[PDB]
Design a protein around this ligand. Sequence first.
Ligand SMILES: [Cl-]
Length: 167
Amino acid sequence: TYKATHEFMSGTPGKELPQEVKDLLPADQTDLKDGSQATPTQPSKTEVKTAEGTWSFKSYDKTSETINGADAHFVGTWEFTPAPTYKATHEFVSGTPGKELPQEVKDLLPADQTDLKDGSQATPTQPSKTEVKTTEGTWSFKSYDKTSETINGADAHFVGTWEFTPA
Ligand SMILES: [Cl-]
């Protein structure tokens, strides 16, 4: 007689299995008759959440094997899905009463920042330039309303003020 053993591996490049997944490795099956079919023991659960994301059991490499004069070994793969991420968006406003932003200023609104981790610090993207001259006068960027904000379970939003000086 022979045994059937198990091992787990990550199927997600750059991610090692956490101990909570390794803790689910099945026990060896013992006393298997030579020439019988061995089938791997399924893990007692197929999902493990961590602070980084969720691991989900995919399958073993073989769903059975014939015992042929040696112990059998089954390799089970788990895959990782990162925890939900958030965005940081931007908006521009005029800080000059009675003056609306021209399109040339609005055209400088930064792109959204994506794939920000929960609990991370977001800092707004600075405009590509900070002055725009028009026939009427010049627009200058002042600042965003905050220098940074912690992502705490929601998208962030930064408001940038431009001021106008007439020609
Ligand atoms: Cl993890």
